[PDB]
Amino acid sequence: FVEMVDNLRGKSGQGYYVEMTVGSPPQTLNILVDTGSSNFAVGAAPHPFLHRYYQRQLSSTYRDLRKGVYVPYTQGKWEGELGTDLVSIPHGPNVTVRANIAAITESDKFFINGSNWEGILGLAYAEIARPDDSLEPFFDSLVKQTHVPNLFSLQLCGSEVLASVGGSMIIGGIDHSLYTGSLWYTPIRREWYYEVIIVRVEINGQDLKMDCKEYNYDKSIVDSGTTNLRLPKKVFEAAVKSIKAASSTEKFPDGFWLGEQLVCWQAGTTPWNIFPVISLYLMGEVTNQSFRITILPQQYLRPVEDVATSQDDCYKFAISQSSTGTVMGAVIMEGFYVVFDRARKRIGFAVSACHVHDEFRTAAVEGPFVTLDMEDCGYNIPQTDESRSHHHH
Ligand SMILES: C[C@]12CCCO[C@@H]1[C@]1(COC(N)=N1)c1cc(-c3cccnc3F)ccc1O2
Ligand code: NI
Numbered sequence: 001f002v003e004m005v006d007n008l009r010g011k012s013g014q015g016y017y018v019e020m021t022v023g024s025p026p027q028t029l030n031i032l033v034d035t036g037s038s039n040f041a042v043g044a045a046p047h048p049f050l051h052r053y054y055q056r057q058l059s060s061t062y063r064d065l066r067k068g069v070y071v072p073y074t075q076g077k078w079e080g081e082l083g084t085d086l087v088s089i090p091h092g093p094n095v096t097v098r099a100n101i102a103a104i105t106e107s108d109k110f111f112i113n114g115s116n117w118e119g120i121l122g123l124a125y126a127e128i129a130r131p132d133d134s135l136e137p138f139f140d141s142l143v144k145q146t147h148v149p150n151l152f153s154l155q156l157c158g159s160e161v162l163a164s165v166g167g168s169m170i171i172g173g174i175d176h177s178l179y180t181g182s183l184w185y186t187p188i189r190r191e192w193y194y195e196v197i198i199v200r201v202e203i204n205g206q207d208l209k210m211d212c213k214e215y216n217y218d219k220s221i222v223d224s225g226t227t228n229l230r231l232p233k234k235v236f237e238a239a240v241k242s243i244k245a246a247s248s249t250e251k252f253p254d255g256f257w258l259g260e261q262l263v264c265w266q267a268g269t270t271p272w273n274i275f276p277v278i279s280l281y282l283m284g285e286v287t288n289q290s291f292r293i294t295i296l297p298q299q300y301l302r303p304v305e306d307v308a309t310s311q312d313d314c315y316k317f318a319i320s321q322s323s324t325g326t327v328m329g330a331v332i333m334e335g336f337y338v339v340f341d342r343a344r345k346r347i348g349f350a351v352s353a354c355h356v357h358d359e360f361r362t363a364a365v366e367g368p369f370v371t372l373d374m375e376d377c378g379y380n381i382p383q384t385d386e387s388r389s390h391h392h393h
Contacts, residue, residue, distance in 0.1 A: 001175045007091035008033060008156070008167035013227050013302060013316075014115040016156055016330075018169055021088045022101060023059030028090070032120045033154070033169055034225035035194055035340065036327075038129040039071065040087070040138040042119030044080060044103030049111040050118055056103060061086045069102050071130045076109035078102075087138070092171045095146045099138045102130075114162070123152065123224075123340070127192035139342075148172040150343040154224060155179075157354035158334035159310045163303060167354075179337035179350035184291040184365050186282035188345045189378060193221040196347060197283040198326060199290045199377045200369075201235065203242035204276030210238065212377035215280075219325035219379065222338065222347055226329030228259070229278075229300060230322035239278070239319060246276040259320050262304055264312040272297055272358055280328070281369060285346065288374040291367025293349050295335045298356040299363065302331075325379075335363035 009030075010016040017030040022042060029042055029052065043053040056062045065082040080103045088096045104110070104119070111118075126133040126140065136144075143150045148171060155178045156167040168178060189195040198215040201208045217232045231239055240257055250271070255261030265271070275297035281290040301315040318331045335355050339348030355363045 001170045001173050004092055004170045005168045005175060005177070006166060007089075008169055009116070010165045011115055011161070012158070012163040012165055012304075014112050014162065015117060015227075016165065016167055016224060017115075017117040018092070018121065019090050020119075020121070021090060022054050023056070023085050024061040026088065027054060027058065029054060029119050030117045032117045032225065033123065034120050034223075035123045035154070036221060036223035036225040037120065037122035038124045038126060038137045039069075039102055039120065039122045039135070040099055041071075041078060041080070041102035041104050041122075043111065045105045047107065047111055049113045053118060054101070054103060056083065056085075059085055065100075067131075069131050076107070078104045078107040078110040080105040082135070089171065092169070093142075093146070093148050095142070095148060097142050097145045099141045100135055120225075124193055125191040142171075151339065151341050153178070153337060153339045153348075154333065155337045155352055155354060156224065156330055156333045157352070158299065158330070158356055159305050159307055163305065174339055174348075178353050180353060181351050182365060182367075183337075183339065183348045183350040184282075184367055185285050185339075185341070185346040185348045186291075187285060188347060191345070193219065193223070194340060194347060196220050196222060196328075197377050198280050199283050199371070199374070200279075200281035200292075201239070202279040202281075202292075203239060204246055205279075206242065208235070208238050208242070210235065212375060213379050215326060216377055217325060217379045218381050220328065221325065222328045222333070222340075224330065224333060226327045227302075227331065228318045228320045228327070228329050229331040230320050230327035230329060232325060233321055233323065235326070236319070236321040243276060243319075247274045249274055256317055259317050262306065262314040262316055264306065264309060264314040267311055267313055270313050270315075273360065275301065277361060280332070282349070283377065284368060286368070288370050288372065289368040290371065291349075291365060291369065293332070293336060294364040294366070295332060296357055296361055296363055298358070299335050300331050336365065
């Protein structure tokens with residue numbers, strides 16, 4: 001999969017994107033790679049943050065579906081018109097498919113100034129597609145229309161402009177050059193988000209000792225479309241307390257722990273060793289087994305270059321509170337080669353050949369850990385009448 005290696009780009013904290021083409025003749029757009037959503041949607045009208053957009057009128061193969069779509073979220077929305085057109089990934093498989101495309105005609109706090117992407121590729125399942133689960137997601141169409149295996153894998157690699165990032169999205173396979181050591185699999189609990197189960201959390205080798213359901217309240221997901229490691233309120237509080245205690249030689253402002261303020265050291269003198277490793281134990285394929293993924297401060301402290309002090313190394317704390325469960329975002333994924341094995345309903349982790357580390361510690365993937373009579377760590381989201389009333393024909 002040499003032709004697919006190094007096909008992702010982006011700016012730190014602003015998402016990873018892949019080049020895609022839409023229409024006939026092909027119109028190139030940069031598309032956010034998002035395992036936390038399920039729509040393929042592209043800017044299709046002028047916007048202050050867009051240099052270019054999908055021009056449906058220029059495409060001989062465009063078909064209007066005569067249906068609108070409206071997608072609200074916390075402090076924003078995108079909306080537009082549904083259609084289909086021919087889509088390819090220039091640095092991906094040598095195939096062209098007819099996919100659903102949402103042509104974004106209006107948005108609020110969707111596009112990001114300077115992110116260099118013009119659309120979003122939702123790689124998650126139909127259950128969370130808008131307007132409903134009958135709108136076939138891109139990857140489903142790709143698999144159904146081509147001989148491409150039902151699997152993709154992601155290797156995300158972490159003064160006036162933000163830092164450039166790179167990575168690989170390998171579609172239809174696993175590239176052995178992108179990882180070292182063992183590849184460990186956790187089950188996809190349910191096909192909507194890429195939902196997984198965390199059975200144990202340690203901070204510098206010390207167990208948080210919480211009821212494991214707390215780790216997955218109200219879900220845990222693997223999400224390339226979220227920058228941070230996001231943790232449920234109670235878990236976040238325990239983690240922050242433990243990390244503060246380890247790094248206690250340094251007294252940072254409250255703003256730092258909230259992700260609202262940078263902390264700096266003189267260039268090259270960052271005391272990495274005062275910050276603890278964080279281990280998340282994920283449910284194994286075998287009932288009473290787990291494996292752990294371990295990340296370093298190099299992953300959860302994000303570099304941000306400061307104009308006012310360019311001779312310092314400055315960092316943002318990239319673990320944040322969630323009210324919608326654990327989110328294993330770019331902070332987690334940058335440690336690892338992550339295999340989204342849809343065919344076998346499982347997610348694989350191995351140490352990334354590109355992860356940032358030092359001479360003392362490394363991001364790790366280790367197992368098995370067996371637990372006699374393992375508890376159920378999964379949370380069952382209370383069923384609303386809304387959800388219950390839906391028929392699924
Ligand atoms: C809010 C939605 C539209 C509705 C569905 O969720 C989308 C979301 C939020 O979380 C994920 N997984 N994708 C999303 C993430 C980013 C982003 C921003 C910064 C860095 N990386 C990114 F992916 C930008 C836009 C965006 O749009
Ligand atoms: Ni019915």
